[PDB]
Design a protein around this ligand. Structure first.
Ligand SMILES: [Zn+2]
Ligand SMILES: [Zn+2]
Lengths: 548, 548
């Protein structure tokens, strides 16, 4: 069997891995994946927020296609998913961790699908077999299925009304006061929970447990190990909470001038509470060391996972992908969170290690090919031995980039989308709910964001790598604006909604379509004067079919 | 109860009704609908071919949304339909005649939906309760469910291998030879079948039978009486086959010059066998009198239907719509069939008679409002007492045009689409299968068709009502081209894929979104420094909720 382990971390910046240049945070286990595989430096997500980014990852389709545009918007019933495509070629699609899926209960009810049936559960899980579904954010008192992690904590002797919140995501003060990890001021406090029982440790162990169980199921698998960290709450168990400090924190990338007459959508984002707080040096210096500790814990735990795989021979037959759903500003551009399309939000780490001999020639290399998160789906289908259905999947298999040391890659532009109708910006910018649209196009140098109702945003990342000089209204950038806008015009038109007939289904008939009339083959006779005319054409059809 | 009777005829030109100006074909029963209702002179279909036009009619969504782009491409499982929206407000959606639906068997199989279950059958029928499903074209030897019409003929004493073909759509020569109605040369021959047992007579009677049965079901209904005629086979029972002759046939609208350096897509269409034959005066003179006879039979039969409704009081509470799925060139523009977007193909008759008092002020009037076939779905939901879901339905309810003698109508452009990958034009124009795109935009005067890979087609219907002078490459038309292309650019971007959350679902939270942080309401705490900051914001939320 050839398997796939798809590792994702939520809200992980590409530049917080040492293989992508971080000077103070050593991630040797993740770096080793890159040393033996391919590291991608132009990988972009198709939205920069958890839900829509992940819906694109799990469908291989743009947000403009699937329509799950914001956190919590259910993925429509009947939307094809990666799980469907892998099942079609005999590979399991299994989840250990987060997807941010919300079931289309209304759509299922219409179709009489019991949401708790085998089919219904899988539809609600976005085409995943949920070994351990856990989106990693469980405030009191969220209403959903209890994450297995809560019962795990209780069984391990950690009792609470909300074990996830109290034990894994809060600290206890020197006096006994409760220090909620929801609060940025407590990023420096050690979580109550011992490291071995923390979320990242738990989920890593669950992945090991899955692999053990899967080995004597016998079927090939694609396992999505999807970590919530380093997404907030920004709090980590000892010894990771005091491993780093303010001196390890790289400077914020921002300027006073970039705020002057800023694009209205950008201005609105800087006004949110997370942005105002991450604007403060005191906040960055306290929170970012926790973020770094969370990533270090992931790297340590992946070391355990990879050792486990090696000792069971899984290292020889399992392709490993390491990536993120989007980044985190942590104060860059005067923002917190991950809205808009600056590098820190929209560019993700992407490392792929295929242990197959076919990938030998590219080991330890760096690809600057324009790559999208939606490329993973066809990559996986291709790896699994199937022909990716390109009337449904909108991306490109990455296998040629792993398997050819000098392959031709025809993508000229990557794209990403934001529907901001659930943000205060909708009201501040005076937009109707359906009219809060922003779309990024990037060609490797120029990044343009079209914002409906407004001027575009434009950066030249060669001259202005920190994206501090918006050229959206600059007369000197007219030619670039026109080219990138034309790319957007074509992209909006390049739909893949014709999902119930493949291109392949047209081709066998082409010799008859070229010279004759395929309708006659079914006895449908359109535009013929007399019997002689019909029969003469039927003889031409017979001749053509004889030639082919 | 308030009901709806939605009458459609397949391949019926708007100008072959006397109320739209035909000088030789009197359609008094259809004209009477117009005399007591509203007749629309700018109604356009969203594709000009049966399948995709109808899929748009039955979903209220553009082809670019639903993806059923050609005849026979199944409508995807999970695509919302008119039947769903009517059911949500307690109105039945019943079919008597043609839909051109093809079940998404693959999609249903994935979801474990038995195609023969109650839910499965309805999904396969595009959201219709199929009282009598019959697409009206049954060549030997099509493979599908036997139309009820065949058993009807057999029971009436008309036996044959294929009763539809032999009796309803063929003639017997003076010597006894079989004269197939598939052949244009037999358009002048009377069908074997007596008029009372012909397709149009049969389907009209079936509609009466439905209405009788429905009356003591008690539930309000929308009944789609969907005639195959005057679509081919172009053959009709006596006495309709010799009611008209060559002298009644209006001149073809075409010119030698329009063919000179014609747009490549147009040129390709003129090369098809139906186009080459309808180019001949001999063919027009033989076929068009049959087409006229078929329409006369429809008008006579509708007279019977309306009398039946009046004698049962259904005339008082049933809105009647009369329309078509597209037209027929019959030799106009050197074409047969209905491809491309010339008036004869893309503009449909549309008459709506609402017997409610609310429609009194507009009776007998003519509306030149820009109207689309996709407007019928929200019109019907609105009439049925529901709020049309505009995150799903892409058109506009027409009720304001019926109920206000001077209402504001904000549509500036209508749109229609063609995917020509199933035509020889794909090969002749050198296009990939996904790249055979043409989209019409019309503003009431100018009609532009963008054709991917080629120059646009452009007509000014005020100066050039016959669409003989293509301005697509004319420098004098630059401003018009830019305006209409910008309308297309916006239309391609104006998607409605976010079908699992309504706009209404956003609004209750807006006072909190405007001033505060809705996430705190669920205990999700993003970007807050300390407990004081969180609690102060929670108090602001409480204040806001108290104000509203
Ligand atoms: Zn995320
Ligand atoms: Zn039709």
């Amino acid at each position: 069997n050839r398997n796939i382990l798809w590792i994702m971390c939520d809200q992980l910046r590409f530049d917080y891995l040492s293989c992508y240049g971080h000077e103070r945070l050593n991630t040797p286990n993740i770096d080793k994946l890159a040393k033996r595989g391919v590291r991608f430096t132009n990988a972009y997500v198709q939205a920069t927020v958890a839900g829509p980014s992940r819906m694109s990852a799990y469908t291989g389709r743009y947000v403009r296609s699937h329509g799950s545009t914001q956190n919590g918007i259910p993925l429509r019933v009947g939307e094809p998913t990666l799980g469907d495509h892998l099942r079609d070629v005999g590979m399991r699609n299994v989840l250990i961790g987060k997807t941010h899926m919300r079931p289309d209960l209304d759509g299922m009810k219409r179709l009489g699908i019991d949401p708790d049936s085998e089919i219904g559960a899988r539809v609600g899980e976005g085409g995943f077999d949920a070994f351990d579904r856990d989106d990693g954010v469980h405030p009191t008192g969220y209403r959903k299925k209890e994450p297995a992690y809560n019962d795990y904590l209780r069984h391990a002797g950690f009792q609470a009304e909300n074990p996830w919140e109290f034990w894994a995501n809060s600290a206890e003060g020197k006096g006994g006061e409760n220090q909620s990890g929801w609060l940025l001021t407590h990023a420096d406090k050690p979580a109550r929970v011992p490291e071995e029982h923390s979320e990242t440790a738990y989920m890593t162990r669950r992945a090991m447990e899955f692999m053990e169980a899967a080995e004597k199921d016998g079927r090939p698998w694609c396992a999505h190990l999807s970590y919530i960290k380093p997404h907030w709450p920004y709090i980590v168990p000892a010894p990771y909470h005091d491993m780093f400090g303010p001196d390890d924190v790289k400077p914020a990338v921002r300027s006073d001038e970039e705020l002057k007459a800023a694009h209205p959508l950008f201005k609105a984002m800087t006004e949110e509470v997370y942005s105002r707080n991450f604007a403060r040096d005191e906040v960055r210096e306290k929170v970012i060391p926790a973020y770094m500790g969370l990533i270090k814990q992931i790297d340590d735990q992946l070391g355990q996972l990879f050792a486990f795989m090696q000792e069971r021979g899984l290292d020889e037959n399992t392709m490993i992908v390491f990536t993120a759903d989007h980044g985190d500003y942590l104060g860059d551009h005067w923002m917190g969170e991950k809205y808009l399309f600056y590098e820190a939000a929209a560019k993700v780490p992407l490392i792929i290690y295929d242990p197959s001999d076919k990938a030998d020639a590219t080991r330890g290399t760096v690809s600057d090919a324009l790559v999208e998160m939606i490329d993973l789906a066809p990559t996986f289908v291709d790896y699994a031995g199937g022909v990716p259905p390109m009337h449904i999947l909108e991306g490109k298999s990455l296998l040629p980039l792993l398997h050819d040391d000098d392959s031709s890659w025809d993508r000229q532009y990557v794209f990403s989308e934001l529907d901001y109708s659930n943000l205060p910006a909708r009201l501040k910018l005076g937009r109707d709910i359906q009219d809060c649209r922003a779309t990024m196009v990037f060609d490797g140098r120029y990044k343009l964001v079209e914002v409906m109702g407004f001027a575009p945003i434009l950066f030249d990342l060669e001259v202005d790598p920190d994206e501090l000089k918006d050229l959206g209204r600059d007369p000197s950038a007219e030619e670039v604006r026109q080219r990138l806008t034309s790319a957007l015009d074509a992209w909006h038109r390049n739909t893949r909604q014709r999902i119930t007939k493949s291109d392949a289904a047209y081709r066998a008939l082409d010799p008859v379509l070229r010279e004759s009339d395929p309708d006659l083959m079914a006895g449908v006779i359109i535009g013929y004067w007399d019997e002689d005319e019909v029969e003469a054409e039927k003889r031409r059809i017979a001749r053509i079919l004889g030639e082919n």
